[PDB]
Design a binder for this molecule. Structure first.
Ligand SMILES: CCCCCCCCCCCCCCCCCC(=O)OC[C@H](CO[C@@H]1O[C@H](CO[C@H]2O[C@H](CO)[C@H](O)[C@H](O)[C@H]2O)[C@H](O)[C@H](O)[C@H]1O)OC(=O)CCCCCCCCCCCCCCCCC
Ligand code: CLA
Ligand code: CLA
Ligand code: CLA
Ligand SMILES: CC(C)=CCC/C(C)=C/CC/C(C)=C/CC/C(C)=C/CC/C(C)=C/CC/C(C)=C/CC/C(C)=C/CC/C(C)=C/CC/C(C)=C/CC1=CC(=O)C(C)=C(C)C1=O
Ligand SMILES: CCCCCCCCCCCCCCCCCC(=O)OC[C@H](CO[C@@H]1O[C@H](CO)[C@H](O)[C@H](O)[C@H]1O)OC(=O)CCCCCCCCCCCCCCCCC
Ligand SMILES: CCCCCCCCCCCCCCCCCC(=O)OC[C@H](CO[C@@H]1O[C@H](CO)[C@H](O)[C@H](O)[C@H]1O)OC(=O)CCCCCCCCCCCCCCCCC
Ligand SMILES: CCCCCCCCCCCCCCCC(=O)OC[C@H](COP(=O)(O)OC[C@@H](O)CO)OC(=O)CCCCCCCCCCCCCCC
Ligand SMILES: CC1=C(/C=C/C(C)=C/C=C/C(C)=C/C=C/C=C(C)/C=C/C=C(C)/C=C/C2=C(C)CCCC2(C)C)C(C)(C)CCC1
Ligand SMILES: CC1=C(/C=C/C(C)=C/C=C/C(C)=C/C=C/C=C(C)/C=C/C=C(C)/C=C/C2=C(C)CCCC2(C)C)C(C)(C)CCC1
Ligand SMILES: CC1=C(/C=C/C(C)=C/C=C/C(C)=C/C=C/C=C(C)/C=C/C=C(C)/C=C/C2=C(C)CCCC2(C)C)C(C)(C)CCC1
Ligand SMILES: CCCCCCCCCCCCO[C@@H]1O[C@H](CO)[C@@H](O[C@H]2O[C@H](CO)[C@@H](O)[C@H](O)[C@H]2O)[C@H](O)[C@H]1O
Ligand code: OEC
Ligand SMILES: [Ca+2]
Lengths: 38, 27, 65, 35, 37, 34, 34, 335, 340, 254, 30, 51, 35, 77
């Protein structure tokens, strides 16, 4: 199908993106938490 | 809560009457 | 079949079987009352749940006056 | 009561022998093909 | 008196009988305790 | 003991009634020619 | 291109590291007991 | 006679028996009839059992005030511990029924037979030319009965601590277990519920997907089941239509198209999960319990800030502090 | 008409099928999952249950959770902009607004998803038995996370979203409702337990009853993605079980329908039992038993034993589990056996 | 043939026997009501409304009969605890009596509609085969409902031509049957104000009468008739049930 | 009275078992 | 009396059980009369209250 | 009349319609850009 | 575009080697700067109780809840 072009900003990109950026914004915080002393 | 199931059942059986009994051909 | 007095008198009411309006008929007009009802329920719901308070409306056993 | 012990013992021996002398009887043999 | 043309026969195979009874009996074994309470 | 008086009949009819149902069918099925 | 088997073993160790940091955090953080 | 014994072995092993009494069966059939027959009598007429060795008989049979839900066959005495208590070890039956003798006669014969039942699930598969391994699926539920009826007691030092043979008696085993081991907070139990929940889940997935993608061959007013004849050549459902739907529900590569890989997963999941659950009970049988996060999170001054882990400890203490009212004489519960 | 164009677009076959349903599913499903993941790591349950409940406070994957709202809130929907939070976000968080958020959102998300199955089914032209089945999980979520607490004093007694926070929900039900003794919970487990059996048993029956369609040992490749013959001997399977168990299937259509039925019926029953626990209409005791236990001090069953375990659970937990009750149980009033 | 759980499909398109069926059901539900009544009357103790009121005696039907007016017995006593009162014919006995008869009649009716199943009224003039114009039916029925809904609020609850309904103070000490005046203000949406139960039935009744007419005249837009497989009675069911369980979850909450 | 009821049902399930295993409808091929 | 009666947990619909059949009277019994308000006090005259 | 909670109701009833809006806006638009 | 191709494209990494650690360092700072504590009203190790008090700041009434919470922060809680 098609002379195999493909667009950069696809559709699924979004799906995998709203679950992407956040996943890191957290796994980045959650790590920095380990250094919180009493 | 039991009737909910009836709705979901009868409704489905109305929108899929055609495919009831089974399906067929193509791929 | 078997016609009957009552049967004939009622014959009209049941005859326009598959008769449908064309296209999207009254749909849009319907989709508005529908949205209105939806908002109406949310109100009476939120009133019972004391999320939407309204001086004058006291949702308790009292109010009986 | 000392009897029952004896009997039980006998009874269990029977079956346990029947069991060993069973698989011993060339059990691999018993099956559909290759044997 | 025209023989109504909308009727079909009814059936219950032997296996269904069994599956049925198994259900009735065990439910009974499960609820009798609470009935006698 | 100190059980419920209706417990017995509740259990009896709970078993009989539906069992009698199935049975009526199975036998009427079973005897249908051909 | 970048060979897949390397994308994996790299992204892999990368996870054992972060998930391991969490396990260490368990004997030091607030989730400690000390 | 081609030779009696030669014949005997041909019958036993015969694949033409309505029920395949195998070689393993020769041990199974008797042990299982004893276990079953003793149980049924016990459960109905056995008298009270001094389960905790403190002369405080717990009656668990129907004729002695129990109903199906409460009734059970009570575990051997704690006075007995792990000692073997065969009937011929008692001055009388009266003495044997009081110390919970029936319990051992039952658990031992059952566990024995249920194993051979596994040995059989292999044998028949062999005599029939089919691949083995089914018996390996059954190793999970068996490995549990074993864990709950033997490992735990060996580990704990007494058969009186094995799971009772009754409905309520089982809930007792659970509630107390939780208190002494905090099992809900143990990896193995969790894997267990994943396998069971998952199983039921998948069981429903498969079941529906398949049943919903069946090729039509039945009337509008005819059981959709008749559309299948025992001994068919081709398949009865469109596994390609099935995959077509399920692949769109989630996304293609996250869906099975290989019936063999589907069914392996279908078996692998629950069996693997239950294997861990069985290893959990067999592991907490040596007191390696669940995670203990009591008073972990504490504040800046040292105050203890509770977590749900703590609310769980209170519920556990209630169980600890109330189980076996009169059995303890000292501070620590080391038994 | 734009409508059919809007449709056209939606029902377009992508990697992640959207569909009309998605307009409801994805917004919610993501918000629910998101709110959880948020609270799990950031929001606390101090002002609500006097409990640390997030990574930020020190909780680990087991002890973390999105705890229910205070008991003061009652059954309030706790909207971000409602009388409680008053548009404020941080307060909302501290008053457990995130619970009704996850709850209510996820709720719609389960509606959307089932609709999806229904919509995708229709398009692909297959029967909707995947949707019927999913009614079971809806019922559970609905009765347990909504109907239940709706019968109690407030959302506070609904299960809090979290691993450990769910175990206490279990322990609670034993201790207060003596739930394990409930006919419906039993059916529940008979189904889930029995369903996880059909699963395992059927799977193995298939893998070890397969025909040889390849020359390899790893028989996975030997499968015809394109129907034709049955890949396993249904006829052999029948004879196997018919000789080892005495009973055995022989109608794949039924064997598979059975597999839908067992676990879906089980969960439905477990739901009804809870719909009853809402009104506290539990299956707590057996009256004939209690009466004999009163008059006769030597009568003891595994049942009476259990009830005592409950007394302990209630007495030792109630205090820190129902803070709003300002319970104070003097050491002397606390039920306890000897020594322990 | 038909599996056991499908035997009733034998009616999916036999409007005659479908009505015969629905008639029998109504008969049993009415019958039950009548006799559940008599059962309560044969065991309910009126000797004390203060400490031993109907709700302590496992009464289930007796209350629903008081909420709308029937509060006396032909034997002389009364729910509120008064004497010398004359309930007239509509006493608990009366209500119970009535239903038992309405049941007997619906029975006979169910029989007639079963034997004379092939009335022409169910056959479409065009196709000459069995058919029911649902869309118009719904309009008709909905018209009658709102018409009755209206009357109930308009004449019964208001006292114009009826008893009224149960009304009591904030601590159930004074309760009784009293005529309730409508309430269109905002506080009429307060569940605890009787005035709202009146207004509702008058307004909703009217809206119900209007809407019925609409549906008796305007036809269903092709798009919908197709989407919601109308003209297929087994869909009238799917929607009704959805409404019936909605009604249910609500009565359970109130 | 209760004991009898419990044992009866049990006895009935075992009877069922028997008939189910030994009096099923022979499973016929093709 | 009527008023005092509503202030008794034995009329709370939340008490009860699924198989605890019958009227509320098969439970605590047919209510006959109000014994009266109970005030508890301790040696010091202090008035105590029952949780 | 128009109490604080009544104002909030509007704020949510308005903040809600908007979301439905931008959503159906964006959707109706991109839908009509290919098919 | 087949994930496989993308997860392998040097362009991809050229982009994400920047983007990924970006997001990470951000969230890190979110916690490490104490901002998160204020966005979620979550207590700092030194803010569960006032120095002396050992009571819990339990919210006791819905409507005046927010107000009640504010006061709890008052006693230097
Ligand atoms: C498939 C299924 C798909 C489901 C999809 C659902 C989508 C969204 C669902 C939203 C549900 C929100 C429920 C609203 C609510 O709970 O709102 C609840 C409020 C009730 O408010 C409660 O009121 C209680 C007591 O009030 C009463 O008693 C008090 C005591 O003094 C006072 O006197 C007060 O004046 C008086 O009103 C307590 O105060 C509680 O804290 C408070 O929550 O009204 C009400 O219930 C509103 C009436 C609704 C009834 C519906 C019930 C349906 C099933 C019920 C099963 C129960 C078992
Ligand atoms: C409210 C009206 C309503 C109506 C008119 C129907 C009508 C029908 N349903 Mg249905 N259903 C309903 C509600 C309703 N259902 C609800 C609430 C549920 C959820 C539990 C279901 C779940 C359901 C399923 C799963 C199936 C049907 C099927 C059918 C058809 C069955 C044929 C038959 O009568 O079996 C005859 C029934 C029997 C011989 C025995 C039933 C014994 C038990 C269940 C009841 C005993 C009576 C009880 C004490 C009475 C009180 C009831 C209470 C609600 C008031 C039929 C058209 C079947 C179908 O369409 O197949 C193609 C089918 O498979 N229904
Ligand atoms: C629809 C609601 C309804 C309600 C709320 C009630 C409520 C009540 N009734 Mg009525 N009743 C009803 C319908 C109803 N009834 C009908 C239709 C009849 C005629 C058949 C009666 C006949 C009746 C009598 C004769 C009496 C009552 C009495 C009572 C009161 C009894 C108190 C009690 O302990 O309940 C007990 C409740 C139960 C046992 C319900 C549990 C049901 C469980 C056991 C089984 C479900 C079975 C199924 C097989 C499960 C799984 C199946 C699997 C396939 C999935 C109570 C107020 C008594 C009374 O008034 O005393 C003063 C009394 O004597 N009722
Ligand atoms: C796609 C579907 C979708 C759905 C169904 C919901 C549903 C819901 N969200 Mg949600 N949300 C969504 C997407 C969605 N959201 C997205 C994409 C975001 C990110 C921007 C959010 C962010 C969000 C937040 C931050 C919150 C919610 C909350 C809520 C709940 C609010 C209760 C309420 O008042 O409803 C709103 C209802 C309406 C607006 C009614 C619509 C009426 C239409 C049909 C007609 C309007 C006509 C006209 C203008 C009316 C004028 C009448 C005149 C007489 C005055 C509710 C369950 C709150 C919550 O979870 O509280 C616990 C909350 O705080 N949502
Ligand atoms: C007097 C005395 C002693 C009295 C009592 C003694 C006593 C302790 C009795 C205890 C019993 C008791 C009271 C139990 C209570 C539990 C109970 C009755 C609950 C009843 C209510 C309930 C659970 C209702 C609904 C829930 C539900 C669906 C449960 C289902 C449970 C169930 C049947 C699970 C299946 C178990 C099982 C062995 C399935 C086997 C399937 C089949 C034979 C596999 C073989 C097979 C596999 C293939 O893959 C293929 C291809 C083929 C072809 C094939 O054949
Ligand atoms: C008002 C009063 C009302 C009184 C109501 C009377 C009671 C009615 C009783 C109904 C009996 C139902 C039995 C019928 C049989 C049946 O349904 O199968 C019949 C149906 C349909 O079966 C199909 O029948 C078709 C033609 O009829 C074809 O023959 C198909 O091949 C066949 O599959 O199958 C099912 O119902 C599936 C249900 C699965 C049963 C699960 C068993 C439950 C066991 C759980 C675990 C128990 C463990 C015990 C522990 C000890
Ligand atoms: C993109 C698409 C994504 C789709 C799904 C994502 C699903 C994610 C689940 C994420 C769970 C994260 C838990 C976490 O981050 O914890 C972070 C925490 C906190 O750890 C604690 O951190 C505190 C400071 O914040 C302190 O340092 C404590 O001492 C420390 O113990 O977790 C762990 O240490 C977890 C070990 C977890 C092992 C988990 C197995 C989980 C299996 C889940 C589901 C199986 C099915
Ligand atoms: C603490 C230690 C943890 C131990 C984990 C053990 C995991 C074992 C998983 C096996 C599940 C058993 C299901 C039986 C199911 C069954 O019969 O299918 C078995 C299936 C192989 O089927 P084959 O037709 O390919 O077997 C023939 C040849 O391949 C030789 O084995 O196993 C696998 O796919 C490999 C799994 C190992 C990876 C783990
Ligand atoms: C993603 C993925 C993956 C992954 C993986 C990984 C990530 C891996 C890694 C790995 C690794 C990472 C490894 C390592 C190894 C190592 C080794 C093996 C070593 C050894 C060593 C030695 C031996 C040494 C020595 C010494 C020293 C150094 C000093 C002192 C002394 C001595 C001498 C001792 C896989 C494939 C699964 C698949 C899917 C995907
Ligand atoms: C809430 C909310 C919101 C928003 C937000 C969101 C939506 C978020 C999201 C978020 C997210 C979405 C997040 C995530 C996170 C994640 C994480 C943190 C993860 C982690 C992980 C891990 C740790 C893993 C691991 C593992 C496993 C599990 C398995 C095995 C292997 C491994 C080791 C790899 C809004 C405004 C709308 C409104 C209100 C509410
Ligand atoms: C057990 C049970 C149940 C159920 C039940 C039911 C469903 C019932 C029904 C019932 C019914 C459904 C009843 C009915 C009754 C009826 C009646 C009682 C009728 C009668 C009639 C009559 C008496 C008539 C007469 C007459 C005629 C026909 C003609 C003219 C003249 C005269 C008036 C003489 C339930 C599930 C809840 C739960 C568990 C238990
Ligand atoms: C994009 C999606 C946005 C979603 C919701 C935005 C909500 C803004 O919501 C709005 O915030 C203001 C405060 O700033 C609140 O204002 C509220 O608290 C203040 C005090 O702080 C009161 O003086 C005011 O009387 C009260 O109504 C509104 O009650 C709330 O409805
Ligand atoms: Mn049965 Ca294990 Mn708690 Mn020591 Mn006894
Ligand atoms: Ca410090």
């Amino acid at each position: 199908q098609e002379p195999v072009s493909y667009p950069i900003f696809t559709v699924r990109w979004v799906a995998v993106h709203t679950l992407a950026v956040p996943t890191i914004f957290f796994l980045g915080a959650i790590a920095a938490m380990q250094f919180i002393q009493r | 809560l039991l009737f909910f199931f009836g709705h979901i059942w009868h409704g489905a059986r109305t929108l899929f009457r055609d495919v009831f009994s089974g399906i067929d051909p193509e791929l | 079949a078997r016609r009957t007095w009552l049967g004939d008198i009622l014959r009209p009411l049941n005859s326009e079987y598959g008769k449908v309006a064309p296209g999207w008929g009254t749909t849009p007009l319907m989709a508005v009352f529908m949205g209105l009802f939806l908002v109406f329920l949310l109100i009476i719901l939120e009133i019972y749940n004391s999320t939407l308070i309204l001086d004058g409306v006291n949702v308790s056993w009292k109010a009986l006056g | 009561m000392e009897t029952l012990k004896i009997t039980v013992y006998i009874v269990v021996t029977f079956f346990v022998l029947l069991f060993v002398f069973g698989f011993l009887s060339g059990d691999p043999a018993r099956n559909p093909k290759r044997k | 008196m025209e023989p109504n043309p909308n009727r079909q026969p009814v059936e219950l195979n032997r296996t269904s009988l069994y599956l049925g009874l198994l259900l009735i009996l065990v439910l009974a074994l499960l609820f009798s305790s609470y009935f006698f309470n | 003991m100190e059980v419920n008086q209706l417990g017995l009949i509740a259990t009896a009819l709970f078993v009989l009634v539906p069992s009698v149902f199935l049975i009526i069918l199975y036998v009427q099925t079973e005897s249908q020619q051909k | 291109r970048i060979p897949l088997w390397i994308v994996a073993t790299v992204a892999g160790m990368g996870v054992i590291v972060i998930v391991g940091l969490f396990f260490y955090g368990a004997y030091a953080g607030l989730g400690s007991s000390l | 006679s081609a030779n009696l014994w030669e014949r005997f072995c041909n019958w036993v092993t015969s694949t033409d028996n309505r029920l395949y009494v195998g070689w393993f069966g020769v041990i199974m059939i008797p042990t299982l009839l004893a276990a079953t027959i003793c149980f049924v009598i016990a459960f109905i007429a056995a008298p009270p059992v001094d389960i905790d060795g403190i002369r405080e008989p717990v009656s668990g049979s129907l004729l002695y005030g129990n109903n199906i839900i409460t009734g059970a066959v009570v575990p051997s005495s704690n006075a007995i511990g792990l000692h073997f208590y065969p009937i011929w070890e008692a001055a009388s039956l009266d003495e044997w029924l009081y110390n919970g003798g029936p319990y051992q006669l039952i658990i031992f014969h059952f566990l024995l037979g249920a194993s051979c039942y596994m040995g059989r699930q292999w044998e028949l598969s062999y005599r029939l030319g089919m691949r083995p391994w089914i018996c390996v699926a059954y190793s999970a539920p068996l490995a549990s009965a074993f864990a709950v009826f033997l490992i735990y007691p060996i580990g704990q030092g007494s058969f009186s601590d094995g799971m009772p043979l009754g409905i309520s008696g089982t809930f007792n085993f659970m509630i107390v277990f939780q208190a002494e081991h905090n099992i809900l907070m143990h990896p193995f139990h969790q894997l267990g519920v994943a396998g069971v929940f998952g199983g039921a889940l998948f069981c429903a997935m498969h079941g529906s997907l398949v049943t919903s993608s069946l090729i039509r061959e039945t009337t509008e007013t005819e059981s959709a089941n008749y559309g299948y004849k025992f001994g068919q050549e081709e398949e009865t459902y469109n596994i390609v239509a099935a995959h077509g739907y399920f692949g769109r529900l989630i996304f293609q590569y996250a869906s099975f198209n290989n019936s063999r890989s589907l069914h392996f997963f279908l078996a692998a999941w629950p069996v693997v999960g239950v294997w861990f659950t069985a290893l959990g009970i067999s592991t907490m049988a040596f007191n390696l319990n669940g995670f203990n996060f009591n008073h972990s999170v504490i504040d800046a001054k040292g105050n203890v800030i509770n977590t749900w882990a703590d609310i769980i400890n209170r519920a556990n203490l209630g169980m600890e502090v109330m189980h076996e009212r009169n059995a303890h004489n000292f501070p620590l519960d080391l038994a | 008409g734009w409508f059919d164009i809007l449709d056209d677009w939606l029902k377009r076959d992508r990697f992640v099928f959207v569909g009309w349903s998605g307009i409801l599913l994805f917004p919610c499903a993501y918000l629910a999952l998101g709110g959880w993941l948020t609270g799990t790591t950031f929001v606390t349950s101090w002002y609500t249950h006097g409990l640390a409940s997030s990574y930020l406070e020190g909780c680990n994957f087991l002890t973390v959770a999105v705890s229910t709202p205070a008991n003061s809130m009652g059954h309030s929907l706790l909207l971000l902009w409602g009388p409680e939070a008053q548009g404020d976000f941080t307060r909302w968080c501290q008053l457990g607004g995130l619970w009704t958020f996850i709850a209510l959102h996820g709720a719609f998300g389960l509606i959307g998803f089932m609709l999806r199955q229904f919509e995708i089914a229709r398009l692909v032209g297959v029967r909707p038995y995947n949707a019927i089945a999913f009614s079971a999980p809806i019922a559970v979520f609905v009765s347990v996370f909504l109907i239940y607490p709706l019968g109690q004093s407030s959302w506070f007694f609904a299960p809090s979203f979290g691993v450990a926070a769910i175990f206490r929900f279990l322990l609670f039900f034993q201790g207060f409702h003596n739930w394990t003794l409930n006919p419906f919970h039993m059916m529940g487990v008979a189904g889930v337990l029995g369903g996880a059996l059909l699963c395992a048993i059927h799977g193995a029956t298939v893998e070890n009853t397969l025909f040889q369609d390849g020359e390899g040992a790893s028989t996975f490749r030997a499968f015809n993605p394109t129907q034709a013959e049955e890949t396993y001997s249904m006829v052999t399977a029948n004879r196997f079980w018919s000789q080892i168990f005495g009973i055995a299937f022989s109608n794949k259509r039924w064997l598979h329908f059975f597999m839908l039925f067992v676990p879906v019926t089980g969960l439905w029953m477990s739901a009804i039992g809870v719909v009853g626990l809402a009104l506290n209409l539990r299956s707590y005791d057996f009256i004939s038993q209690e009466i004999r236990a009163a008059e006769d001090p030597e009568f003891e069953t595994f049942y009476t034993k259990n009830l005592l375990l409950n007394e302990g659970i209630r007495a030792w937990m109630a205090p820190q589990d129902q803070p709003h009750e300002n319970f104070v149980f003097p050491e002397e009033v606390l039920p306890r056996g000897n020594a322990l | 043939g038909l599996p056991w759980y499908r035997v009733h499909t034998v009616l999916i398109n036999d409007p005659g026997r479908l009505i015969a069926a629905h008639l029998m059901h109504t008969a049993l539900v009415a019958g039950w009501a009548g006799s559940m009544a008599l059962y309560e009357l044969a065991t309910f103790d009126p000797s004390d409304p203060v400490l031993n009121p109907m709700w302590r005696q496992g009464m289930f039907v007796l209350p629903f009969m008081a909420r709308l007016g029937v509060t006396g017995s032909w034997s002389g006593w009364s729910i509120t605890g008064e004497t010398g009162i004359d309930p007239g014919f509509w006493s608990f006995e009366g209500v119970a009596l009535a239903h038992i008869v309405l049941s007997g009649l619906l029975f006979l009716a169910a029989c007639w509609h079963w034997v004379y199943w092939d009335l022409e009224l169910f056959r479409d003039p065009r196709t000459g085969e069995p058919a029911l114009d649902l869309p118009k039916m719904f309009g008709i029925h909905l018209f009658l409902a709102g018409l009755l809904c209206f009357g109930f609020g308009a004449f019964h609850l208001t006292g114009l031509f009826g008893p009224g309904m149960w009304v009591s103070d904030p601590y159930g000490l004074t309760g009784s049957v009293q005529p309730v005046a409508p309430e269109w203000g905002p506080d009429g949406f307060n569940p605890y104000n009787p005035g709202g139960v009146v207004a509702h039935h008058i307004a909703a009744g009217i809206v119900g009468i209007i809407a019925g007419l609409f549906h008796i005249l305007v036809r269903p837009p092709q798009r919908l008739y197709k989407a919601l497989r109308m003209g297929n009675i087994e869909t009238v069911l799917s929607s009704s049930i959805a409404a019936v369980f909605f009604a249910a979850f609500v009565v359970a909450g109130t | 009275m209760e004991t009898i009821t419990y044992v009866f049902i049990f006895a009935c399930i075992i009877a069922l078992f028997f008939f189910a295993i030994f009096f099923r409808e022979p499973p016929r091929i093709t | 009396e009527k008023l005092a009666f509503y202030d008794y947990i034995g009329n709370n619909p939340a008490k009860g059980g699924l198989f605890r059949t019958g009227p509320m009277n098969k439970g605590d019994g047919i209510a006959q009369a109000w014994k009266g308000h109970a005030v508890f006090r301790n040696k010091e005259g202090e008035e105590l209250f029952v949780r | 009349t128009i109490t604080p909670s009544l104002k909030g109701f509007f704020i949510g009833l308005l903040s809600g319609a908007v979301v439905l809006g931008l959503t159906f806006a964006v959707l109706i638009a991109i839908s009509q850009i290919d098919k | 575009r087949p994930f496989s191709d993308i997860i392998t494209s040097v362009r991809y990494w050229v982009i994400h080697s920047i983007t990924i650690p970006a997001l990470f360092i951000a969230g890190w700072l979110f916690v490490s700067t104490g901002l998160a504590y204020d966005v979620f009203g979550t207590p700092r190790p030194d803010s569960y109780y006032a120095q002396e008090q050992r009571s819990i700041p339990l919210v006791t009434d819905r409507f005046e809840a927010k107000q009640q919470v504010e006061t709890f922060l008052e006693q230097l809680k």
